[PDB]
Design a protein around this nucleic acid. Structure first.
Ligand code: DDS
Ligand code: MG
Ligand code: NA
Ligand code: NA
Ligand code: NA
Ligand code: NA
Length: 538
DNA sequence: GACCACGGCGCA
DNA sequence: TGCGCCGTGGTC
């Protein structure tokens, strides 16, 4: 059972970290298991040099830490990836363990033994599941290596810039805070939604609109505040206060404190088994939700910069989820729009909601986007009218004139739900699965909620599969050009390239992304270059 | 000190 | 539709 370090090749690794973040963790223990024997490493760090590959639960995490120490240790087989492909609700080692025959403990040796056992059991369950096997070998397993390099590389942050911006925003916050209190006739904690509720609906005469989900309090959400924007001067200042405090507390203040001492850069984690649809997630810190939609947000984007002598290259799949819907549904009108190379939102703004596409004003185009997104998420005419500043009836029509112009989308949604009810799951173009039991619920509200989750997954998940595949293909090509892949934001990639190669890099990555997997419609990629994330965007 | 539920909101 | 993080108001 107990055998001296080192282990034979192909052994499963087990390791304990002082904390969950690979880039910040002390490696406390390092074990390995193979053929019914466990090898525990006398000194974890030195023991790392003996390994040729990290095979086991949470492989990437160990690879990231290895890369941190200047070791080129790649992640290989990971039972978590197998489990997640079988059922995307398999997101943690704790859960996967109890489910497939072990216990996730806090000891390296037991973790190595667990990894071996779980892999054997899980690999057998993936026999016959050829499409999931293809996903594992061709996408998830290789992807884990790409992600490990991204995590270890990190991205550069203009700290002094954010420090200065912080002091600016702090001053503006105090003005709004002072005004709000003037209008309230007294100070209170403006960050407390409970105290705000009292002030708005009880102390001021403002009418409550909706209520909160769990506790049933009168909501003070943006949707509610926006509707009361001209019911009282205090509202506008509260909306602005919300924006500034959100951005300051979430990005401006925390980010500078997260710079790594060795790298001088910011290192997120790209979670590979975290979502029900097949998307990645980002945490510690989350870099897939850096602001950009507001002025202040854009000034925050500017903080993410290229290394000196380098440029950022930002690549973005144009309307990918819509293109994927065109393919999956086979709707002629939708397919023709993309094949003719037309702006789908502009076309959507003419095909319905009047005419003609020579064209529509910009405010009309966002109207079309709202509809499209709405269809994507199964948004009711209610929330659509509230999202469109138009009477409820005006929204109902807009939704109908949509399914008139793109009939096969309707047929596709109905077909997807029917098959989901029979099989108990839905799938992406590549066969990635999400089980959706509640399609058979006897409570309409629950059932319908489940339906929206169900038919959306094939779209969101196919777009995720495509991006993942693209990253897998793109990565080796960048390596050979001396370029870096830094971040992924669902439909977008951010790279780093030497100034002199930035053009060549952008051209190559663009073409690699557009040709990732030919569909019934072309994939168009928009690319931008700049010294910071904002100026690199379009 | 850590952790929780909630409402709220940042991004795709 | 899918995430992860914030402060509040709390518990332990
Ligand atoms: N405000 C919002 N609300 C909900 N979902 C949103 C969103 N913004 C984006 N998404 C979702 C849906 C799409 C995706 C981001 O795509 P783009 O925002 O770039 O819209 P695209 O289709 O490319 O039209 P373009 O104007 O760019 O031509 O994330
Ligand atoms: Mg876009
Ligand atoms: Na991992
Ligand atoms: Na139904
Ligand atoms: Na989606
Ligand atoms: Na090569």
């Amino acid at each position: 059972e107990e055998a001296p370090w080192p282990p034979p090749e192909g052994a499963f690794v087990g390791f304990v970290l002082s904390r969950k973040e690979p880039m910040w963790a002390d490696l406390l223990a390092l074990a390995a298991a193979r053929g019914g024997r466990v090898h525990r490493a006398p000194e974890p760090y030195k023991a790392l040099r003996d390994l040729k590959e990290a095979r086991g639960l949470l492989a990437k995490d160990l690879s990231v830490l290895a890369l941190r120490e200047g070791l080129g240790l790649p992640p290989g087989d990971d039972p978590m990836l197998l489990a997640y492909l079988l059922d995307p609700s398999n997101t943690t080692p704790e859960g996967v363990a109890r489910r497939y025959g072990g216990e996730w403990t806090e000891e390296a040796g037991e973790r190595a033994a667990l990894s071996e056992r779980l892999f054997a059991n899980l690999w057998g369950r993936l026999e016959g599941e050829e499409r999931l096997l293809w996903l594992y070998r061709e996408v998830e397993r290789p992807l884990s290596a790409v992600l490990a390099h991204m995590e270890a590389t990190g991205v550069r942050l203009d700290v002094a810039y954010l420090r200065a911006l912080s002091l600016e925003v702090a001053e503006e916050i105090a003005r709004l805070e002072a005004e709000v209190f003037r209008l309230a006739g007294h100070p209170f904690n403006l960050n407390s939604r409970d105290q705000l509720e009292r002030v708005l609906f009880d102390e001021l005469g403002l009418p409550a609109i909706g209520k909160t989900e769990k506790t049933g309090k009168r909501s003070t959400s943006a949707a509610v505040l926006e509707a009361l924007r001209e019911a009282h001067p205090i509202v506008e200042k509260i909306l602005q206060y919300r924006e500034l405090t959100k951005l300051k507390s979430t990005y401006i203040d925390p980010l500078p404190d997260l710079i790594h001492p060795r790298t001088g850069r910011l290192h997120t984690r790209f979670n590979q088994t975290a979502t029900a649809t097949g998307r990645l997630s980002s945490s510690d810190p989350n870099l897939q939700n850096i602001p950009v939609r507001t002025p202040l947000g854009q000034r925050i984007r500017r903080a993410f910069i290229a290394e000196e002598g380098w440029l950022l290259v930002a690549l973005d799949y144009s309307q990918i989820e819509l293109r994927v819907l065109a393919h999956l549904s086979g709707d002629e009108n939708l397919i023709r729009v993309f094949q003719e190379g037309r702006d789908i939102h502009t076309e959507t703004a003419s095909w319905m909601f009047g005419v003609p596409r020579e064209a529509v004003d910009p405010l009309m185009r966002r109207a079309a986007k709202t509809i499209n997104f709405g269809v994507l998420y199964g948004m009711s005419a209610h929330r659509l009218s509230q999202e469109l500043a138009i009477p409820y009836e005006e929204a109902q029509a807009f939704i109908e004139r949509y399914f008139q112009s793109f009939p096969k989308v309707r047929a596709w949604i109905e077909k997807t739900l029917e098959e989901g009810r029979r099989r108990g799951y839905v799938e992406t173009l590549f066969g990635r699965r999400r089980y959706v039991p509640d399609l058979e619920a006897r409570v309409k509200s629950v059932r319908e909620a489940a339906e929206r989750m169900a038919f959306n997954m094939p779209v969101q998940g196919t777009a995720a599969d495509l991006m993942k595949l693209a990253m897998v293909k793109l990565f080796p090509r960048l390596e050979e050009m001396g370029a870096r892949m830094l971040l992924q934001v669902h439909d977008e990639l951010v790279l780093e390239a030497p100034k002199e190669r930035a053009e060549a890099v952008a051209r190559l990555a663009k073409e690699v992304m557009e040709g990732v997997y030919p569909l019934a419609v072309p994939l168009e990629v928009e690319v931008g270059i700049g010294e910071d994330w904002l100026s690199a965007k379009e």
